[PDB]
Structures are given as C-alpha cells and as structure tokens.
Design a protein around this ligand. Structure first.
Ligand code: 8K2
Ligand code: 8K2
Lengths: 237, 300
C-alpha cells in the first residue's frame, strides 16, 4: 500500500520502481491586470520521474502550450502527468517497465491508476514520506532545460552523477534528499554552500559538484546545519 | 387476488410479505396469506425467532404458478414449493379460507408504496440475477454474495448483478481517461444502457431489486449494487430528462420506506452526499433531497 519509514529499504531492492512527483507540472506567476484584476501566466513545467535505485531521472518537460484553451488546469495537470507517465512506461522495453510507481501526492493516485489500467501488474502506491522533489527546479541545469524548452520534450539525467561508483543507492538517495531539502528550505544558502569554493566544479556531464568523499561529508554537515538553522529561524528556537 | 398457503408453522418465526410483517408462534394454527395483489412481484421472507441469523425469502409472481410454503425439519427452513395439480391446490386453499386460517395481505386502497418500489421489477429478470432454473420463484438470503464480491465463493448461490466498476477498462475509453472518469456518461449511456441493459427500465428494475434485497434481507452485496447504480447516474453529466425524473421518484419511495432505525447501516454517507450535493445531478433530485434532508439530516 503506502510507503513510509518502516519499509524504506524497499526503495533500493531490485524490483524496478519509479517515484512520480507532479509539483512542478503546472506553474504560474500571478499578476495584476490593467483593470486591477488578477491573472496568472503559465511557465514551462516538468514531471519528475525518478528510479531511486539507479538515479535515472526521466524529466518530461511540460511546455506552456499544452494549457492553451484548457480549463481547470490544476486538475488537468494531474491527468496530463498520468498520461505522460503511462506513455513513458509503454515506451520502455518490458524488462525495463517498473513493477511499482510511487506518487508523491495522493491526488495523483486515481489519475495514474486510470491511465494504467492496461498494466494491472504495476502497483500504484502513495507514500507517507515528505519528499523534497519540488526543489528539483533549484537544480540549475534542470531549471535551465525546462525554461529553454520551446516544445514538449523529455530529457534524461542521472540525478546521482557518478556517486554510485563510491556509495550505495541508499546513501545516494539520502544525500539527494538532504540536498533537495536544504534547497527547499533556503535555496540561497544551499547554493552558496554548494558553490562557495571555485576549485570544486560541476562537470559538463553532471548536475552537482565534483566533491571528494571528505568534502561531501563537510557539505552534508553544512546542509544539516542549514536545515537546523532555518528550523530555528522559522520557529524562533 | 391470490393465495400462498402454508402446510404448517412448526417454528416461531417473523414472516414478511412485501413491506409488511407479522409474528407467528411455534405451532400456531397459521395456514398462509390471502388477498395478494395480482399484477406485481412479491417477496415472502422469514426470520426465525430462535435464530435471527439468516433472514431468507422467496421472490415470486402468482401469475406464474401456484406456490405454497412448507417447513422442512431437515434443512431447517420454510421452503417455497410449486403445486402443478391446480384442482387439488384450490380444494386445500378453499378449506383454510373457509376456516379463516390465513392472514390478509393488508393493502390500503390509497397506498401505492409497493407498486412504486417494484415498478420495473419483473420476475423474468429476477431469475437471471438469481440462478435456479427448476423453480419459478427465487430464493434470496442475508449471506448470498454477488458475482463482483466473488471477484474480489459458490457460483450457483450468487447474485448475478451487473458488475459496475468505475476504474475498469469497460468504464474508460482509451484516450478519454480524464473525460470518462470525471463524467461517466459514456459508461452509463453507451456501455450500460445501450450495451447491457438495452433500456432504462431494465436498469431501474435491477436497481429496485438491489434495494429491496438489501432492506429486506440485510444483503451487503445488494446494498453495494444499489449505491453503485445511483452513483453511476448521478456522476453522469448527460442523462435523459425522463430517467432523472423517474430516478428521483424511485429513490424517494425507497427512502420513504426505509426503517428509520436501519438508516445507519443501509445508507452510504459518501455516496449520498456526493450524489445530492456535489454531482452533476445535485439539483435534479428534488423529491429525494427533500425527504433525505427532513428524515436523515444527520447523514448529511
Ligand atoms: N400442494 S398441495 O398438496 O395442493 C398443497 C399441500 C399443502 C399446501 Cl399448503 S398446498
Ligand atoms: N455491512 S454494512 O455495510 O453495514 C451493510 C450495509 C448494507 C447492508 Cl444491507 S449490510
């Protein structure tokens, strides 16, 4: 059924699974009209579909043209997400199709379940984990490809860069979620932590900097402090 | 007017006949029910005094044969049977009627309740839902499961209601996933009405039969079916005006007849609030909403 802290290691077993996060599919800026009313202007979005074991990120970009002339866009966005994920599964060879898809928001369950009726063996699940995948747009190279898109497009990333050569997927996922949590709680401080040091660069084929093992421990500590910092700033503790 | 005579009443039992019921004491000189209105189906049902487990009973139509009840001490129940000797059936019945050993079906002349609850119910259709072809009458009880319940265990003792499933490939057209899930008109009109039921009368008839089974026997599967068939109409944006008007009438008399003290268990809060207040037809069921709000405002 639902995914939570008790069954956390299942994410890293050998049953293919994908996380689907739709928090960046429908994105708007709200603004005033000449007449003093309020209007929204859509901006490009993305579906964030992630194999937590391999790091493979299937970033489907949602170009603002797909909203043209549609109504009830927040509701349409969940059904558009579900359509794109089902199209993705059908495009994958059978042995690459997931055995489970975990949605990060429960509103996605019915829309995905309906789109996936052809795949009765694929289990569609919620999760109780508060995951920070909404912060994926704080990753500059992903943000950049989303805003530059002029048409619907799918871009493939490994969100763990080369980390799996050195750590397990359980540790890679924990790092990723700590980075995204920090970016979500204070984007500026998080980015400063990640890029303060000019001698550590981001390889052209990577998303995050090329930290040694020791430097990653330092980075990880600084991100915990940030989250703790912001927690105190927020709650006056 | 027709008669369902009883060989005897050997065990204490509460006997229902349509929306009526009366107590018969162990070995009381009871020999059946007379003056049953011709023209409608009927149900005669039983709850033993010593064991209220298993309400059970028989749907029948007196035009289709001569039926009597005889207790079976081996299977422990009142069994409906068919007498093909017409003459002999008339002699015994006339004896009991001359000896005033029968209760009179107690219909008030103003009262259209039973007709209103069974308007579209036909014995031939009942017999397709309840499979036992060597009898012209149909046995039902509390514990019988539906075909869908068996999909989620004896197939011969099941209620073969039409399976309705909103998250099924039948209900959802490829390429119209959102459209068909949020507006069920395709499933209602093309799949179910044109495809399976052929017309709205067969659809309403199953709906009424489901409600009656649920209320008279406490059959959960029937209750599920009744709620599903309501929700399917209420969740369709496009429904013929005459079905909506008729549906409002059907439900109104079902709600009117429901025992107040059984509402808690027989009425699905989610389905009714959705149907009356959120659905496409939220404003199309004036009579049903009014009685629901004055009779069961707690549920809402
Ligand atoms: N079936 S019959 O022998 O005519 C008859 C017997 C007992 C009845 Cl009640 S009706
Ligand atoms: N078991 S239950 O849902 O309360 C029930 C509902 C309707 C019945 Cl009839 S029995």
């Amino acid at each position: 059924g639902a995914m939570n802290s008790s069954n956390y290691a299942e994410l890293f077993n050998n049953d293919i699974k994908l996380f689907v996060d739709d928090t960046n599919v429908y994105r708007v800026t709200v603004h005033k009209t000449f007449e003093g009313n309020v209007a929204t202007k859509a901006i490009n979005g993305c579906i964030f579909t992630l194999n937590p074991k391999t790091g493979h990120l299937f970033l489907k970009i949602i170009h603002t043209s797909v909203w043209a002339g549609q109504k009830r866009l927040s509701q349409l966005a969940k059904w558009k997400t579900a359509e794109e994920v089902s199209a993705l599964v059908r495009s994958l060879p059978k042995e690459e199709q997931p055995k489970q898809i975990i949605v990060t928001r429960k509103a996605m369950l019915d829309p995905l379940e309906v789109h996936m009726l052809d795949f009765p063996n694929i289990a569609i699940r919620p999760t109780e984990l508060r995951l920070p995948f909404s912060a994926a747009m704080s990753i500059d190279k992903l943000s950049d490809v989303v805003m530059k898109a002029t048409e619907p497009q799918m871009v493939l990333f490994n969100i763990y860069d080369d980390w799996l050569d050195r750590i397990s997927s359980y540790t890679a996922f924990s790092r990723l979620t700590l980075l995204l949590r920090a970016l979500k709680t204070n984007e500026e401080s998080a980015k400063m932590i990640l890029l303060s040091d000019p001698t550590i660069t981001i390889k052209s084929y990577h998303l995050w900097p090329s930290f040694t093992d020791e430097q990653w421990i330092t980075i990880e500590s600084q991100m915990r402090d940030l989250i703790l910092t912001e927690y105190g700033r927020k709650y006056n503790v | 007017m027709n008669t369902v005579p009883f060989t005897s009443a050997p065990i204490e039992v509460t006997i229902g006949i349509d929306q009526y019921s009366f107590n018969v004491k162990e070995n009381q000189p009871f020999h059946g029910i007379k003056d049953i209105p011709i023209g409608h189906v009927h149900v005669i049902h039983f709850q033993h005094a010593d064991n209220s487990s298993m309400r059970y009973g028989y749907w029948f139509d007196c035009r289709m044969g001569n039926f009597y009840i005889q207790y079976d001490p081996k299977d422990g129940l009142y069994k409906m049977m068919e007498e093909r000797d017409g003459a002999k059936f008339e002699n015994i019945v006339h004896n009991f009627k001359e000896r005033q050993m029968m209760v009179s079906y107690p219909k008030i002349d103003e009262d259209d309740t039973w007709y209103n609850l069974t308007e579209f119910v036909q014995m031939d259709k009942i017999r397709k839902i309840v499979r036992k072809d060597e009898n012209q009458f149909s046995y039902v009880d509390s514990s019988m499961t539906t075909v869908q319940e068996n999909e989620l265990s004896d197939p011969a003792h099941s209620l073969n209601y039409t399976v309705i499933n909103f998250k099924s490939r039948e209900a959802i057209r490829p390429g119209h996933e959102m459209e068909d899930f949020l507006d069920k008109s395709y499933y209602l009109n093309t799949v179910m009405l044109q495809g399976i039921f052929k017309n709205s009368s067969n659809y309403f008839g199953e709906l009424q039969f489901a409600f009656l089974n649920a209320m008279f026997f406490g059959n959960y599967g029937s209750s599920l079916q009744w709620h599903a068939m309501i929700e399917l109409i209420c969740s369709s944006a496009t429904v013929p005006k005459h079905m909506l008007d008729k549906l409002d009438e059907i439900l109104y008399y079902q709600i009117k007849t429901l025992p107040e003290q059984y509402s808690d268990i027989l009425l699905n809060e989610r389905v009714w609030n959705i149907c009356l207040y959120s659905s496409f037809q939220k404003n199309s069921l004036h009579n049903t909403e009014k009685i629901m709000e004055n009779k069961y405002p707690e549920l809402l």
